[PDB]
Design a protein around this ligand. Structure first.
Ligand SMILES: Cc1ccc(O)c(O)c1
Ligand SMILES: [Cl-]
Ligand SMILES: [Fe+3]
Ligand code: NA
Ligand code: NA
Ligand code: NA
Length: 175
């Protein structure tokens, strides 16, 4: 059994105009998380993690994320394949992920050197999940940008308790 807030139609998710793939490369800190599977948790609050975007020769991204868990750095890797338009992607080697039938990424907005908002949508075990990530080039962002991310998340149907701002750490993510 599972009850999820429905995924928004793609019409409600903007696309970053004139997307420059080479400028989006590098490390981003996850300063905000929102989604239908994301829950606020004051007992064990979400720790900040990082995601590195590297363009390959064929213009796909090698996306490597690192998080601090159980006193160790856990790495996980995926391939974002360019989609129907620039700033859009699908997942490479989807068959290597048990239960996964669909995976979409859309870059909503970015200035490339400070911040970015990225929309994800996937179907896993026939359940449709979506999330929005607030990327920061630094671990801290302005209140204006964080409130913008909150209202965009709310526009896609998510309540406050489905929006989290991970706490900055130094382990694993400063590399
Ligand atoms: C929780 C969640 C929602 C959507 C995604 O695309 C994903 O990777 C994770
Ligand atoms: Cl993964
Ligand atoms: Fe994922
Ligand atoms: Na832990
Ligand atoms: Na401020
Ligand atoms: Na750093």
């Amino acid at each position: 059994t599972s009850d999820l807030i429905p995924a928004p139609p793609l019409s409600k998710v903007p696309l970053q105009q004139n997307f420059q793939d080479n400028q989006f490369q590098g490390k981003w800190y996850v300063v905000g998380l929102a989604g239908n599977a994301i829950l606020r948790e004051d007992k064990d609050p979400q720790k900040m993690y990082a995601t590195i975007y590297e363009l390959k020769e064929d213009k796909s991204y090698n996306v490597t994320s690192v998080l601090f868990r159980k006193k160790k750095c856990d790495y996980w890797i995926r391939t974002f394949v360019p989609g129907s338009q620039p700033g859009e992607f699908t997942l490479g080697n989807i068959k290597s992920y048990p239960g996964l039938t669909s995976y979409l990424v859309r870059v909503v907005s970015t200035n490339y050197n400070q911040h970015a908002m990225v929309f994800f949508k996937k179907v896993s075990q026939n359940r449709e999940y979506f999330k929005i990530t607030l990327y920061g080039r630094t671990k801290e962002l302005t209140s204006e940008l964080k409130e913008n991310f909150i209202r965009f998340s709310k526009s896609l149907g998510l309540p406050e308790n489905h929006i989290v701002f991970p706490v900055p750490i130094d382990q694993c993510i400063d590399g």
